[PDB]
């Protein structure tokens, strides 16, 4: 066992005390008065991670050896405690007082669960000395110069009657595997290494190789097969987005037709995000990481972001694959067309018509054509897309209707799946074109 959290530190004067400011009080009063407990864990995990990336960089940055850069948790029954302790970057007595912001987040939630926090922090700035910060969340802290105080920060809590839960090393573990399994520094519990995993959407998609694509479909989608299809989807304009989406090698089945985990800086969100993608997209597996997160308009807003770079990397496909993309659009592309019959906006509908794929008279039986290169094909005065409806190519190649327009050069789009009629029904027009039906 590995623990470094014990009692070394000692305070050899008087505290200073200090007024929390008004509007520190005010949100202290609406923590009081006011639940889903046991995230104050993950909050101050990812404080703990960012405190020791900030020291990593730093150092590294110089010519510096690292020392050793953890993660501690410790639980104490007897004590109805618990306490979080790292060897990051610390802070200086200047910011334990110059206290949403990071700092913020962390004390809100602390204060959800404690009767009283007891905080050391001391900076790895060289000469830097610990101190010790106080408050019972009234509206005093105290703080005093603090001897035996490790570089880094270590958060005691002194858990309230009704939060003793978060004293048992078992809840805690569950909480921990539950929200914060991808934090990127060791992370202990009770001297034991917490087993946690490679973030590999923070990676650069350069980076990531197929086998560790792989390994993270088959955990995200809880799969045995390997995905056909994979998107590393990293900007940070409009929106700040780490995510990585999969196609599953087999077809879609009965589960599939009745999703993706949503994370904020590797701290989980939700394990199944209700409305992250559009429904029709909910064959897709992976993972959603976005800074921005608190249904929303934020949502709403990522939704339509991933659905047009979902829908360009799927065009982007069937350039670089045609046939690898003609089995895609066989086996999923009744999601496709589910997609255009649901949608409200008629920009959203032709952006998925962008996706399918038909048969058409002017080409070779059994070769598929876009909606966009039977628009590049059609002639002078001719103003509309004609299809046809057809079990199969000979049914189609011998309607009467379409036997007569051969005869002027018209192309018509052959469609065999049962769906296709609905489908261009409710599409109604593409690219200002209206869609016609050779027969009615
Ligand atoms: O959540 C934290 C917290 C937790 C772990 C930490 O390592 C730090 C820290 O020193 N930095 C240093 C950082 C430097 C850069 C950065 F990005 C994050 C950092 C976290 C802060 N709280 C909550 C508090 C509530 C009251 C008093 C406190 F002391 C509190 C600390
Ligand atoms: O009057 C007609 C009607 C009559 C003759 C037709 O050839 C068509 C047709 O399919 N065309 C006519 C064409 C003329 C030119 C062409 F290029 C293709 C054509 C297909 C439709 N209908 C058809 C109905 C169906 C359901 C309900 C109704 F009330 C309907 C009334």
Redesign the pocket.
């Known amino acids: 066992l590995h623990s470094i959290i014990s009692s070394t530190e000692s305070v050899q004067g008087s505290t200073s005390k200090h007024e929390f400011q008004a509007e520190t009080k005010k949100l202290l009063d609406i923590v009081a008065r006011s639940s889903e407990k046991e995230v104050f864990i993950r909050e101050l995990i990812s404080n703990a991670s960012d405190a020791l990336e900030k020291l990593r960089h730093k150092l590294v940055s110089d010519g510096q050896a690292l020392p050793e850069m953890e993660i501690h948790l410790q639980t104490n029954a007897e004590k109805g405690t618990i306490t979080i302790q790292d060897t990051g970057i610390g802070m200086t007595q200047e910011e334990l007082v110059s206290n949403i912001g990071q700092f913020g987040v962390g004390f809100y939630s602390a204060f959800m669960v404690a009767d009283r926090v007891e905080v050391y922090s001391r900076s790895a700035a060289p000469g830097s000395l610990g101190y010790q910060w106080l408050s019972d969340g009234s509206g005093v802290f105290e703080i005093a110069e603090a001897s035996g105080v490790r570089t880094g920060t270590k958060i005691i809590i002194h858990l309230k009657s009704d939060c003793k839960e978060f004293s048992s090393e078992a809840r805690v573990r569950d909480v921990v595997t539950k929200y914060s399994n991808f934090v990127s520094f060791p992370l202990y519990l009770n001297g034991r290494r917490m087993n946690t995993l490679q973030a590999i959407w923070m990676m650069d998609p350069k980076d990531v190789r197929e086998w560790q694509h792989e390994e993270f479909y088959r955990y995200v989608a809880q799969a045995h097969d390997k995905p056909r299809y994979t998107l590393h989807y990293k900007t940070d304009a409009p929106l700040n987005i780490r995510s990585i989406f999969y196609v599953p090698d087999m077809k879609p089945s009965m589960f599939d037709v009745s999703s993706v985990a949503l994370y904020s800086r590797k701290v989980l969100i939700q394990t199944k995000a209700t409305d992250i993608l559009p429904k029709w997209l909910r064959f897709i597996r992976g993972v959603v990481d976005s800074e921005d997160i608190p249904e929303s308009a934020l949502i709403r807003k990522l939704r339509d972001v991933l659905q047009q770079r979902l829908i360009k990397f799927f065009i982007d496909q069937s350039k670089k694959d045609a046939e690898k993309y003609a089995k895609f659009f066989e086996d999923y592309g009744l999601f496709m067309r589910e997609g255009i019959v649901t949608a409200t906006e008629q920009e959203v509908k032709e952006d998925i018509a962008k996706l399918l794929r038909y048969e058409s008279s002017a080409l070779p039986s059994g070769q598929l054509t876009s909606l966009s290169e039977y628009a590049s094909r059609m002639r002078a005065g001719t103003r509309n897309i004609?299809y046809l409806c057809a079990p199969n190519r000979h049914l189609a190649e011998h309607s009467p209707?379409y036997e007569?327009?051969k005869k002027k050069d018209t192309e018509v789009l052959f469609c065999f799946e049962q769906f296709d009629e609905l489908t261009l029904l409710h599409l109604r027009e593409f690219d200002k074109k209206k869609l016609?039906?050779?027969?009615?």
């Open positions: 004609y209707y007569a327009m016609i039906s050779v027969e009615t």
